[PDB]
Scaffold this active site. Sequence first.
Site, PDB file in Angstrom:
ATOM      1  N   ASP A 152       0.826  -1.188   0.000  1.00 47.16           N
ATOM      2  CA  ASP A 152       0.000   0.000   0.000  1.00 47.16           C
ATOM      3  C   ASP A 152       0.864   1.242   0.000  1.00 47.16           C
ATOM      4  O   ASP A 152       1.695   1.438   0.905  1.00 47.16           O
ATOM      5  CB  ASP A 152      -0.900   0.009   1.244  1.00 47.16           C
ATOM      6  CG  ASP A 152      -1.785   1.236   1.302  1.00 47.16           C
ATOM      7  OD1 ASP A 152      -2.838   1.245   0.637  1.00 47.16           O
ATOM      8  OD2 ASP A 152      -1.425   2.207   1.997  1.00 47.16           O
TER       9      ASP A 152
ATOM     10  N   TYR B 164       3.076  10.163   0.687  1.00 47.52           N
ATOM     11  CA  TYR B 164       4.122   9.583   1.562  1.00 47.52           C
ATOM     12  C   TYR B 164       5.518   9.987   1.089  1.00 47.52           C
ATOM     13  O   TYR B 164       6.490   9.875   1.841  1.00 47.52           O
ATOM     14  CB  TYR B 164       4.027   8.048   1.640  1.00 47.52           C
ATOM     15  CG  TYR B 164       2.675   7.523   2.085  1.00 47.52           C
ATOM     16  CD1 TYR B 164       1.756   8.353   2.703  1.00 47.52           C
ATOM     17  CD2 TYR B 164       2.331   6.203   1.879  1.00 47.52           C
ATOM     18  CE1 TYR B 164       0.518   7.877   3.096  1.00 47.52           C
ATOM     19  CE2 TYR B 164       1.099   5.712   2.279  1.00 47.52           C
ATOM     20  CZ  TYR B 164       0.199   6.558   2.876  1.00 47.52           C
ATOM     21  OH  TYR B 164      -1.044   6.094   3.269  1.00 47.52           O
TER      22      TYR B 164
ATOM     23  N   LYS C  60      -2.616   6.163  -4.152  1.00 48.27           N
ATOM     24  CA  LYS C  60      -3.698   7.073  -3.798  1.00 48.27           C
ATOM     25  C   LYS C  60      -3.488   8.476  -4.342  1.00 48.27           C
ATOM     26  O   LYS C  60      -2.358   8.996  -4.360  1.00 48.27           O
ATOM     27  CB  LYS C  60      -3.829   7.160  -2.271  1.00 48.27           C
ATOM     28  CG  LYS C  60      -3.656   5.810  -1.560  1.00 48.27           C
ATOM     29  CD  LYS C  60      -4.043   5.866  -0.089  1.00 48.27           C
ATOM     30  CE  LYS C  60      -3.697   4.541   0.613  1.00 48.27           C
ATOM     31  NZ  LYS C  60      -2.249   4.479   0.962  1.00 48.27           N
TER      32      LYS C  60
ATOM     33  N   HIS D 297      -7.646   9.518  -1.819  1.00 48.04           N
ATOM     34  CA  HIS D 297      -7.040   9.427  -0.488  1.00 48.04           C
ATOM     35  C   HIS D 297      -7.926  10.022   0.600  1.00 48.04           C
ATOM     36  O   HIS D 297      -7.941   9.531   1.736  1.00 48.04           O
ATOM     37  CB  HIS D 297      -5.672  10.111  -0.492  1.00 48.04           C
ATOM     38  CG  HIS D 297      -4.718   9.602   0.538  1.00 48.04           C
ATOM     39  ND1 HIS D 297      -3.357   9.585   0.330  1.00 48.04           N
ATOM     40  CD2 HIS D 297      -4.915   9.129   1.798  1.00 48.04           C
ATOM     41  CE1 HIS D 297      -2.753   9.109   1.403  1.00 48.04           C
ATOM     42  NE2 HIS D 297      -3.673   8.832   2.311  1.00 48.04           N
TER      43      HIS D 297
HETATM   44  N1  LIG Z   1      -5.912   7.795   4.746  1.00 47.19           N
HETATM   45  C1  LIG Z   1      -5.388   6.646   4.327  1.00 47.19           C
HETATM   46  O1  LIG Z   1      -5.791   5.896   3.448  1.00 47.19           O
HETATM   47  C2  LIG Z   1      -4.158   6.249   5.008  1.00 47.19           C
HETATM   48  C3  LIG Z   1      -3.542   7.249   5.733  1.00 47.19           C
HETATM   49  C4  LIG Z   1      -2.377   6.804   6.360  1.00 47.19           C
HETATM   50  C5  LIG Z   1      -1.938   5.477   6.198  1.00 47.19           C
HETATM   51  N2  LIG Z   1      -2.588   4.543   5.484  1.00 47.19           N
HETATM   52  C6  LIG Z   1      -2.026   3.175   5.344  1.00 47.19           C
HETATM   53  O2  LIG Z   1      -2.266   2.308   6.476  1.00 47.19           O
HETATM   54  C7  LIG Z   1      -1.026   1.740   6.935  1.00 47.19           C
HETATM   55  C8  LIG Z   1      -1.060   1.141   8.375  1.00 47.19           C
HETATM   56  O3  LIG Z   1      -1.421   2.079   9.394  1.00 47.19           O
HETATM   57  P1  LIG Z   1      -0.347   2.975  10.216  1.00 47.19           P
HETATM   58  O4  LIG Z   1       0.959   3.008   9.453  1.00 47.19           O
HETATM   59  O5  LIG Z   1      -1.049   4.272  10.540  1.00 47.19           O
HETATM   60  O6  LIG Z   1      -0.097   2.311  11.673  1.00 47.19           O
HETATM   61  P2  LIG Z   1      -0.045   0.780  12.195  1.00 47.19           P
HETATM   62  O7  LIG Z   1       0.273  -0.128  11.033  1.00 47.19           O
HETATM   63  O8  LIG Z   1      -1.251   0.567  13.080  1.00 47.19           O
HETATM   64  O9  LIG Z   1       1.233   0.843  13.199  1.00 47.19           O
HETATM   65  C9  LIG Z   1       2.565   1.047  12.732  1.00 47.19           C
HETATM   66  C10 LIG Z   1       3.455   1.200  13.957  1.00 47.19           C
HETATM   67  O10 LIG Z   1       3.471  -0.034  14.701  1.00 47.19           O
HETATM   68  C11 LIG Z   1       4.790  -0.572  14.723  1.00 47.19           C
HETATM   69  N3  LIG Z   1       4.656  -2.025  14.512  1.00 47.19           N
HETATM   70  C12 LIG Z   1       4.410  -2.634  13.331  1.00 47.19           C
HETATM   71  N4  LIG Z   1       4.332  -3.973  13.556  1.00 47.19           N
HETATM   72  C13 LIG Z   1       4.522  -4.194  14.884  1.00 47.19           C
HETATM   73  C14 LIG Z   1       4.559  -5.336  15.687  1.00 47.19           C
HETATM   74  N5  LIG Z   1       4.382  -6.569  15.160  1.00 47.19           N
HETATM   75  N6  LIG Z   1       4.788  -5.194  17.018  1.00 47.19           N
HETATM   76  C15 LIG Z   1       4.961  -3.976  17.546  1.00 47.19           C
HETATM   77  N7  LIG Z   1       4.941  -2.853  16.821  1.00 47.19           N
HETATM   78  C16 LIG Z   1       4.720  -2.951  15.475  1.00 47.19           C
HETATM   79  C17 LIG Z   1       5.515   0.115  13.584  1.00 47.19           C
HETATM   80  O11 LIG Z   1       6.890   0.245  13.897  1.00 47.19           O
HETATM   81  P3  LIG Z   1       8.070   0.176  12.803  1.00 47.19           P
HETATM   82  O12 LIG Z   1       7.497   0.750  11.532  1.00 47.19           O
HETATM   83  O13 LIG Z   1       9.135   1.062  13.444  1.00 47.19           O
HETATM   84  O14 LIG Z   1       8.471  -1.279  12.743  1.00 47.19           O
HETATM   85  C18 LIG Z   1       4.878   1.478  13.549  1.00 47.19           C
HETATM   86  O15 LIG Z   1       5.461   2.309  14.559  1.00 47.19           O
HETATM   87  C19 LIG Z   1      -0.056   2.872   6.637  1.00 47.19           C
HETATM   88  O16 LIG Z   1       1.323   2.485   6.600  1.00 47.19           O
HETATM   89  C20 LIG Z   1      -0.505   3.330   5.257  1.00 47.19           C
HETATM   90  O17 LIG Z   1       0.149   2.562   4.197  1.00 47.19           O
HETATM   91  C21 LIG Z   1      -3.703   4.934   4.862  1.00 47.19           C
END
Ligand SMILES: NC(=O)c1ccc[n+]([C@@H]2O[C@H](COP(=O)([O-])OP(=O)(O)OC[C@H]3O[C@@H](n4cnc5c(N)ncnc54)[C@H](OP(=O)(O)O)[C@@H]3O)[C@@H](O)[C@H]2O)c1
Length: 316
Positions: free
Chosen positions: A44, A49, A78, A111
């Site tokens: 994704d 980004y 997006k 997005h």
């Molecule tokens: N509006 C939208 O459509 C939108 C907006 C933003 C994002 N997104 C997408 O959604 C994705 C996921 O959500 P998110 O990035 O907000 O947050 P998330 O995936 O809920 O959390 C990521 C955080 O958790 C840590 N982490 C990952 N796996 C872990 C594990 N197994 N144990 C402990 N900690 C862990 C990561 O650390 P490290 O990375 O340091 O390992 C990072 O700090 C984004 O990357 C993006 O691609 C969509």
Amino acid sequence: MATFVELSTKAKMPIVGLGTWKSPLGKVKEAVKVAIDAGYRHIDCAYVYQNEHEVGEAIQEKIQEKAVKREDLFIVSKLWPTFFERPLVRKAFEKTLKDLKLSYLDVYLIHWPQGFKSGDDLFPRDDKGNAIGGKATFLDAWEAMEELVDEGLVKALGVSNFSHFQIEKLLNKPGLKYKPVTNQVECHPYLTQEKLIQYCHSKGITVTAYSPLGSPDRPWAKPEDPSLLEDPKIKEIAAKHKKTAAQVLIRFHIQRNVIVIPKSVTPARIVENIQVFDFKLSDEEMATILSFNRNWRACNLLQSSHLEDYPFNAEY
Ligand SMILES: NC(=O)c1ccc[n+]([C@@H]2O[C@H](COP(=O)([O-])OP(=O)(O)OC[C@H]3O[C@@H](n4cnc5c(N)ncnc54)[C@H](OP(=O)(O)O)[C@@H]3O)[C@@H](O)[C@H]2O)c1
């Protein structure tokens, strides 16, 4: 190797994907490489980004080294709302595709539903930090995006952060060629999205859950915010299966047939986050997790509440 959720187009979207939101340069390339080695096929991405060029480099490496074929990857990007005006949709898509070093995208998403001031200032804002709106709407953008599907540059379109009101506005537009295949939204046990998922599914639209781990790293984290990974009740369920809390939080979506995109740049975690197909949460465990709903958003970022198509006021 992840299972799939079938889209309305009959394409198969892998139910676990790698998120790249806030993944730094000098780590995101290696993250995508490790992910592909670990069995991830769905990545994704997004223009906003500003790391698509390094994601593209990683994808290219894995293809030319025969680790994977392009046909078996599922790449999503997006369109950012400063580019809703017709000619800019094309130009923004072109930069995304160029950065990714691809010939097509599998899905291209709107997005955010509200248009911002058109241009290459990605966060146009006033003195208080409020977003500056633009006049082109998400329907204008959709029209331009439909050409990309006409031309085979994009296989399917979708939306992100849409409420059911805005999906209805999209679905009810006369003269639509293509329908959204997914709505990508924040989803986890504190924001279970029950009504939105039910709505989306009723219309043949999948849901993709972002921030499934509650985004522990987000800078705006208020110290009093809830913490999924440290939640004793989530931890209890993980212990029962000798899995990690992260693995439970990911498996939770899989059992609702919801695609989920955990972000990581840490190789151990990337591997951990896809080891979720060798256990099953029971019916009571699923019910318990659903009961944790607090309607709490980690990702309410846009002080754009003053603009027309704001998604987060409606019930769903
Ligand atoms: N509006 C939208 O459509 C939108 C907006 C933003 C994002 N997104 C997408 O959604 C994705 C996921 O959500 P998110 O990035 O907000 O947050 P998330 O995936 O809920 O959390 C990521 C955080 O958790 C840590 N982490 C990952 N796996 C872990 C594990 N197994 N144990 C402990 N900690 C862990 C990561 O650390 P490290 O990375 O340091 O390992 C990072 O700090 C984004 O990357 C993006 O691609 C969509």
